[PDB]
Amino acid sequence: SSNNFGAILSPTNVGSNTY
Amino acid sequence: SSNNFGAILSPTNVGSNTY
Amino acid sequence: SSNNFGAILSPTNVGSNTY
Amino acid sequence: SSNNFGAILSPTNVGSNTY
Amino acid sequence: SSNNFGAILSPTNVGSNTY
Amino acid sequence: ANFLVHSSNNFGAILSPTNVGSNTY
Amino acid sequence: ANFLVHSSNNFGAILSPTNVGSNTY
Amino acid sequence: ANFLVHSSNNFGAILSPTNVGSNTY
Amino acid sequence: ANFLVHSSNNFGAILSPTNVGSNTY
Amino acid sequence: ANFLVHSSNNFGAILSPTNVGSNTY
Amino acid sequence: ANFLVHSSNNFGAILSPTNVGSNTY
Amino acid sequence: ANFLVHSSNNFGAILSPTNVGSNTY
Amino acid sequence: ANFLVHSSNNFGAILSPTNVGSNTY
Amino acid sequence: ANFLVHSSNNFGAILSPTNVGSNTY
Amino acid sequence: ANFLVHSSNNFGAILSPTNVGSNTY
C-alpha cells in the first residue's frame, strides 16, 4: 500500500529502488 | 497505508527506498 | 496510516525509507 | 494516525524513516 | 502494491530499479 | 523590447480535476 | 528594456481541484 | 531598465481547492 | 535602474482553500 | 539605483484559508 | 571499470545567452 | 569501480548569461 | 568502490551571470 | 566503500554574480 | 564505510556576489 503522490527531486540511493 | 503527498527534495538514502 | 502532506527538504537517511 | 502537515527542513536520521 | 504517481527527477541508483 | 515566456511545469499528481474552463497546467 | 518570464513550477499533489476559471498552475 | 520574473514554486500538498477565479499557484 | 523579482515559494500543506479572487501562492 | 525583491517563503501548514482578495503567501 | 554520467536538465527560461564556450545545458 | 554522477537541474530564470567557459547548468 | 554524486538544483532567479569558469548550477 | 554526496539547492534570488571559479550553486 | 553528505540550501537573497573560489551555496 505504498503510494507516493508528490514530486521527488534527486533521490540518490544505494539499495534497490523498487517503486 | 504509507502515503506521501508532499514534495521531497534530495532524499539521499543507503537502504532500499521502496516507495 | 502514515501521511506526509508537507514538503521535505534533504531527508538524509541510513535505514530504508519506505514511504 | 501519524500526520505531518508542516514543512520539514533537513531531517537527518539514522533509523528507518517510514513516512 | 507499490504505486508511484508523482514525478521523479534524477533517481541515481546502484541496485536494480525494478519499477 | 519586451519578451514573454510561460513555463507551466507541473510535477505533482492531480486527483480528479473537475475543471470546465480553460486550464494550462 | 523590460523582460517578462513566468515560471509556475508546481511540485505538490493537488486533490480535487474544482476550478471553473482560468488556471495556470 | 526594469525586469520582471515570477517564480511561483509550489511544493506543499493542497487538499480540495475550490477556487473560481484566476490562480497561478 | 530598478528590477522586479517575485519568489512565492510555498512549502506548507494547505487544507481546503476557498478563494474566489486572484491567488499566486 | 534601487532594486525590488520579494521572497514570500511559506513553510507552515494553513488550515481553511477563506480569503476572497489577492493573496501571495 | 569507469562509469561517468553528465546529466544536464533545464526547465527555466534563458534569455539572450551570449556564449563562446560549451555551456552544456 | 568508479561511479561519478554530475546531475545539474535548473528551474529558475536566467537573464543575459555572458559566458566564455562551460557553465554546465 | 567509489560513489560520488554532485547534484545541483536551482529554483531562484539569476540576473546577469558574468562567468568565465564552470559555475555548475 | 566511499559514499560522498554534494547536494546544492537554491531558492533565493541572485543578482549579478561576478564569478571566475566554480561557485556550484 | 564512509558516508559524507554536504547539503547546502539557500532561501535568502544574495546581491552582487564577487567570488573567485567555490562558494558552494
Side-chain angles (χ1 to χ4, degrees), chain L, chain M:
Chain L
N2 301 19
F3 189 21
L4 283 80
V5 179
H6 301 265
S7 297
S8 300
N9 291 27
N10 182 87
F11 296 89
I14 297 148
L15 310 191
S16 182
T18 64
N19 180 33
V20 192
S22 59
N23 49 29
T24 174
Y25 61 95
Chain M
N2 301 19
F3 189 21
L4 283 81
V5 179
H6 301 265
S7 297
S8 300
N9 291 26
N10 182 87
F11 296 89
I14 297 148
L15 310 191
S16 182
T18 64
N19 180 33
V20 192
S22 59
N23 49 29
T24 174
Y25 61 95

